[PDB]
Nucleic acid binder design. Structure first.
Ligand SMILES: [Mg+2]
Ligand SMILES: [Mg+2]
Ligand SMILES: [Mg+2]
Ligand SMILES: [Mg+2]
Ligand SMILES: [Mg+2]
Ligand SMILES: [Mg+2]
Ligand SMILES: [Mg+2]
Ligand SMILES: [Mg+2]
Ligand SMILES: [Mg+2]
Ligand SMILES: [Mg+2]
Ligand SMILES: [Mg+2]
Ligand SMILES: [Mg+2]
Ligand SMILES: [Mg+2]
Ligand SMILES: [Mg+2]
Ligand SMILES: [Mg+2]
Ligand SMILES: [Mg+2]
Ligand SMILES: [Mg+2]
Ligand SMILES: [Mg+2]
Ligand SMILES: [Mg+2]
Ligand SMILES: [Mg+2]
Ligand SMILES: [Mg+2]
Ligand SMILES: [Mg+2]
Ligand SMILES: [Mg+2]
Ligand SMILES: [Mg+2]
Ligand SMILES: [Mg+2]
Ligand SMILES: [Mg+2]
Ligand SMILES: [Mg+2]
Ligand SMILES: [Mg+2]
Ligand SMILES: [Mg+2]
Ligand SMILES: [Mg+2]
Ligand SMILES: [Mg+2]
Ligand SMILES: [Mg+2]
Ligand SMILES: [Mg+2]
Ligand SMILES: [Mg+2]
Ligand SMILES: [Mg+2]
Ligand SMILES: [Mg+2]
Ligand SMILES: [Mg+2]
Ligand SMILES: [Mg+2]
Ligand SMILES: [Mg+2]
Ligand SMILES: [Mg+2]
Ligand SMILES: [Mg+2]
Ligand SMILES: [Mg+2]
Ligand SMILES: [Mg+2]
Ligand SMILES: [Mg+2]
Ligand SMILES: [Mg+2]
Ligand SMILES: [Mg+2]
Ligand SMILES: [Mg+2]
Ligand SMILES: [Mg+2]
Ligand SMILES: [Mg+2]
Ligand SMILES: [Mg+2]
Ligand SMILES: [Mg+2]
Ligand SMILES: [Mg+2]
Ligand SMILES: [Mg+2]
Ligand SMILES: [Mg+2]
Ligand SMILES: [Mg+2]
Ligand SMILES: [Mg+2]
Ligand SMILES: [Mg+2]
Ligand SMILES: [Mg+2]
Ligand SMILES: [Mg+2]
Ligand SMILES: [Mg+2]
Ligand SMILES: [Mg+2]
Ligand SMILES: [Mg+2]
Ligand SMILES: [Mg+2]
Ligand SMILES: [Mg+2]
Ligand SMILES: [Mg+2]
Ligand SMILES: [Mg+2]
Ligand SMILES: [Mg+2]
Ligand SMILES: [Mg+2]
Ligand SMILES: [Mg+2]
Ligand SMILES: [Mg+2]
Ligand SMILES: [Mg+2]
Ligand SMILES: [Mg+2]
Ligand SMILES: [Mg+2]
Ligand SMILES: [Mg+2]
Ligand SMILES: [Mg+2]
Ligand SMILES: [Mg+2]
Ligand SMILES: [Mg+2]
Ligand SMILES: [Mg+2]
Ligand SMILES: [Mg+2]
Ligand SMILES: [Mg+2]
Ligand SMILES: [Mg+2]
Ligand SMILES: [Mg+2]
Ligand SMILES: [Mg+2]
Ligand SMILES: [Mg+2]
Ligand SMILES: [Mg+2]
Ligand SMILES: [Mg+2]
Ligand SMILES: [Mg+2]
Ligand SMILES: [Mg+2]
Ligand SMILES: [Mg+2]
Ligand SMILES: [Mg+2]
Lengths: 88, 199, 66
RNA sequence: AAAGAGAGUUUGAUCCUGGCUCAGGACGAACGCUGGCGGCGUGCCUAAUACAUGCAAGUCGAACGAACGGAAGUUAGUGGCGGACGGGUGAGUAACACGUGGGCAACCUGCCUGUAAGUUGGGGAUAACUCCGGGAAACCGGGGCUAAUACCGAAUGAUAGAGUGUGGCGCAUGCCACGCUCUUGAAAGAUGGUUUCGGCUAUCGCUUACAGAUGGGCCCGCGGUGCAUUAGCUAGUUGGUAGGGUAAUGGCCUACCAAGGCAACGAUGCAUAGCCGACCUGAGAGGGUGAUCGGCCACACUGGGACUGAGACACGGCCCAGACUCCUACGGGAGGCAGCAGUAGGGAAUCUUCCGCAAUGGACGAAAGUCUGACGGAGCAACGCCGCGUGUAUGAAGAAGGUUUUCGGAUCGUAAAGUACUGUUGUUAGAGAAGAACAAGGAUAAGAGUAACUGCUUGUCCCUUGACGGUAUCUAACCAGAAAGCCACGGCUAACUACGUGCCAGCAGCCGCGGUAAUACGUAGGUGGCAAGCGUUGUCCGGAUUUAUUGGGCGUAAAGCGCGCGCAGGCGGUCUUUUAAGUCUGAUGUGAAAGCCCCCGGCUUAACCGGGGAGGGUCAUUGGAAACUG
């Protein structure tokens, strides 16, 4: 089951996450299908950059955001679009 | 102060009077050691190239390994490799404080920067090798402020270079623009420095 | 040697303490004067001890700071 | 744009040829002397040797029969999913294993997403439990009783099979769409709202079918190693006919038939080796390597086999055989660190039997939640890279004391000592971060679906969680006080004087120094290179144009076969027309991420870490040009 999740990279006690699409089976920092965006939690206003087009393409093919990703996509505001394109 | 030895013989051995004049001349102007006064000898090509390196290294007072690193990234720019080397070294926080007149010698300036006595853009900086850009303001941030050593060195400051601006009421130094090779040292052969590292 | 090869080494320095049935460390280096000697015995690494009353170039010959 | 350094050594002296040696850079390094700190990384290269002791794979009571509780509320076994992922190693392997590019009209795919049909009716058991029996123990038999989303029939339902009709087609074998006849193939309930109880209904499920996504299977072109003092190799081998088997084509297997197939463009054999992105060096072309990080492969004490499953011939699963260790009451039993730590052994050589699921990602669950030696952190080691501390300024024709002196002086040395100043580091005491998003739970609002709810999807508020750790980081004060070694000084190669020894002790990379005035041995004074280091050894590239495509040669220095006839191969006079294999050029797809390089930004700077870009192919499809080779 392919799902979108964070990927930890950076230095010791300085994490930086890169939103990727990959299977659950593959390692956390291993194979991935493609990359969507990044996520910096250290910045006090957390800044995130997303494709907003590859995500919606993937979520109509059987992709599920994880716990932290869903908060990111909701705050950015594309799960509304996933709502509207589903029923419309 | 990475090199804590006597800063008097190095001028005599090199033959150039570091920090203005007086270290070499007036006193014994010949080389230190037992065989200083007599027993002169010729210099080979290796000696002439090597002696040029020693002038820059001991003038700005920094270690060999940094000298090699800052030389490599100096040559990554566009222009003449030798001239870009002194321009890049001139950017160091030690030299700017020395140029402003807050310290008498580079050793005094390096300690002044080291013991958190200065600030750039209102943030304390303790790295002597910090590379100052153009337009940044450098101050003291009170604390020491009216310090006898800093105030004494302000009076004995001779002149101030045209690429640095400083007024002795707020002590707000700044780099007017990137300096020029002609107005730096003028007693070193940068062509010999670059040839030394290409062998 | 530990791998079962019989070689000829050389003891540097002034005076030693080597005897038959003694364990020593050898390292590379050929001596020109000797016909068949091709290795040097390092001093101060094992049963072989440092040279006595060495004031300078002490890292070689394995003599500690006096 | 980029763009290349030489020196010593054959001779009485010279010019060439020619080898040897040196100056540079890099290690997962080791050893010797020495040793303050912080940040970021790295740490069994040998025995794929043998392994004490702990922990690394479980979960679900919302699928089915118990103990505390006056019968409210929480905890074994059957059953489902997961154990095929995550983690380790480099033995084997010279081949579709890998890299790159294609084909599958010759294939499969649990969980995930969408859509369409339904989820109707029965039956017989068996664990657990309860007795009996056997054995030291592992554990094995017999009798009786019970349930389920466990198991087995039944009704209904195939684009599954057979026989056809039509069309539209493609690459030969053949494909796509629709229609007709006949025959087979399915299922499960659980938790709640409403009503009434009939019944309906929300959520999670269950069966069949089709799509997408994901992960795999098979085939093919090209590419990357030594030996010819290794010339033949092969017999299911090569092709065909019929059948078997597989998810799928195929000698994959079998019966018959024929004798073929490969090789000097290097078969076969021996030796060595996981492959790549990449790493080191180099002006470049190349040469050497494949540790750490990422992708693929093979292996799991040594051989062989299969079961269960969507997926295995399965690291912490099973059966047999072998070697080894252990327990036996002698009948028999139990094991596998190349998982995280750790032990012995080998070695010149490599770390803690630590703290947590707080963050990320996994398995189970509807959810809290449980599991996670993955992963976050901490510990040891100057192993490497980066940063800066061992004090600053002024101060004598110049303190004493070393060391030398043609004895007047010179040098250590502005360094002492003196005066003035600072606290990076230290010691003490006070303040104290980010990493946190959550999930769940509570109110709402809007939607799809409803006879109506419950419930589902999205939005906003309330509440909640830190191993690191009182860590990083500030400000308050006192202290120049606790913090400098290593190698060389004849030339190459920067840096020279005394004393001791007397071809002895000894030095050495090469030339070569030492035989009672040694700038070369040993010690001092002084100097020169670096600095928390510095030297030696081992390995690789360079210099080496010393395998010369870039970039050498064969009269006398090494080097033209003793000469001819000639198969294969290499090369080929002049012009015209055509073609488009070589050649040049445009477009599309791809050459992952990380790394080198370019441009910006964050850590007080750097190392380091982010964002964007570039480069990298004798690559595939397709369109052009016609001078040159064909
Ligand atoms: Mg925050
Ligand atoms: Mg010596
Ligand atoms: Mg001679
Ligand atoms: Mg030569
Ligand atoms: Mg070089
Ligand atoms: Mg070197
Ligand atoms: Mg120490
Ligand atoms: Mg030690
Ligand atoms: Mg190993
Ligand atoms: Mg083995
Ligand atoms: Mg055990
Ligand atoms: Mg545990
Ligand atoms: Mg129950
Ligand atoms: Mg359930
Ligand atoms: Mg239970
Ligand atoms: Mg694996
Ligand atoms: Mg192998
Ligand atoms: Mg490997
Ligand atoms: Mg491929
Ligand atoms: Mg029954
Ligand atoms: Mg029974
Ligand atoms: Mg029974
Ligand atoms: Mg039917
Ligand atoms: Mg039926
Ligand atoms: Mg299903
Ligand atoms: Mg795989
Ligand atoms: Mg096949
Ligand atoms: Mg091949
Ligand atoms: Mg057939
Ligand atoms: Mg065959
Ligand atoms: Mg072969
Ligand atoms: Mg070259
Ligand atoms: Mg290359
Ligand atoms: Mg290893
Ligand atoms: Mg073993
Ligand atoms: Mg099966
Ligand atoms: Mg097996
Ligand atoms: Mg297993
Ligand atoms: Mg396997
Ligand atoms: Mg495994
Ligand atoms: Mg195991
Ligand atoms: Mg056994
Ligand atoms: Mg281990
Ligand atoms: Mg050991
Ligand atoms: Mg040992
Ligand atoms: Mg966790
Ligand atoms: Mg989690
Ligand atoms: Mg679930
Ligand atoms: Mg456990
Ligand atoms: Mg633990
Ligand atoms: Mg870890
Ligand atoms: Mg360290
Ligand atoms: Mg060491
Ligand atoms: Mg004296
Ligand atoms: Mg005196
Ligand atoms: Mg402090
Ligand atoms: Mg405190
Ligand atoms: Mg405090
Ligand atoms: Mg969370
Ligand atoms: Mg919630
Ligand atoms: Mg609501
Ligand atoms: Mg509502
Ligand atoms: Mg909601
Ligand atoms: Mg405190
Ligand atoms: Mg402060
Ligand atoms: Mg003080
Ligand atoms: Mg010299
Ligand atoms: Mg003498
Ligand atoms: Mg010498
Ligand atoms: Mg000597
Ligand atoms: Mg000395
Ligand atoms: Mg010195
Ligand atoms: Mg350093
Ligand atoms: Mg070293
Ligand atoms: Mg070496
Ligand atoms: Mg070459
Ligand atoms: Mg030649
Ligand atoms: Mg010729
Ligand atoms: Mg001759
Ligand atoms: Mg000849
Ligand atoms: Mg002839
Ligand atoms: Mg011919
Ligand atoms: Mg022609
Ligand atoms: Mg021809
Ligand atoms: Mg790439
Ligand atoms: Mg910056
Ligand atoms: Mg980076
Ligand atoms: Mg990048
Ligand atoms: Mg033509
Ligand atoms: Mg044409």
């Amino acid at each position: 089951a392919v799902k979108i999740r964070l990927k930890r990279m950076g230095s010791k006690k300085k994490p930086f996450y890169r939103i990727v699409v990959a299977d659950s089976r593959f390692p956390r920092d291993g194979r991935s299908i493609e990359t969507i965006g990044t996520y910096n939690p250290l910045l006090d206003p957390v800044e995130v950059k997303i494709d907003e087009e590859a995500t919606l393409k993937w979520m109509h093919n059987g992709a599920k955001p994880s716990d932290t990703v869903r908060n990111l996509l909701s705050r950015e505001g594309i799960m509304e679009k996933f709502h509207n394109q589903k029923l419309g | 102060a990475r090199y804590t030895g006597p800063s008097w013989k190095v001028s005599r051995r090199l033959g150039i009077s570091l920090s203005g004049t007086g270290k070499e001349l007036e006193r014994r102007p010949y080389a230190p050691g037992q065989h200083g006064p007599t027993q002169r000898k010729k210099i080979s090509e290796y000696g002439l190239q090597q002696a040029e390196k020693q002038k820059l290294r001991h003038m700005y007072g920094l270690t060999e390994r940094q000298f090699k690193n800052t030389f490599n990234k100096a040559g990554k720019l566009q222009g003449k490799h030798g001239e870009n080397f002194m321009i890049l070294l001139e950017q160091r926080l030690d030299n700017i404080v020395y140029r402003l007149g807050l310290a008498r010698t580079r050793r005094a300036a390096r300690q002044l920067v080291n013991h958190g006595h200065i600030t750039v853009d209102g943030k304390r900086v303790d790295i002597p090798s910090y590379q100052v850009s153009v337009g940044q303001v450098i101050s003291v941030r009170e604390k020491s402020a009216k310090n006898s050593a800093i105030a004494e060195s302000l009076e004995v400051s001779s002149f101030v270079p045209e690429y640095v601006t400083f007024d002795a009421e707020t002590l707000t130094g700044s780099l007017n623009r990137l300096p020029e090779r002609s107005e730096l040292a003028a007693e070193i052969n940068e062509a010999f420095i670059v040839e030394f590292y290409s062998r | 040697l530990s791998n079962g090869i019989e070689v000829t080494a050389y003891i540097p320095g002034i005076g030693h303490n080597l005897q038959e049935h003694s364990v020593v460390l050898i390292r590379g280096g050929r001596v020109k004067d000797l016909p068949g000697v091709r290795y040097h015995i390092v001093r101060g690494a094992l049963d072989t001890a440092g040279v006595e009353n060495r004031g300078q170039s002490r890292s070689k010959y394995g003599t500690k700071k006096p």
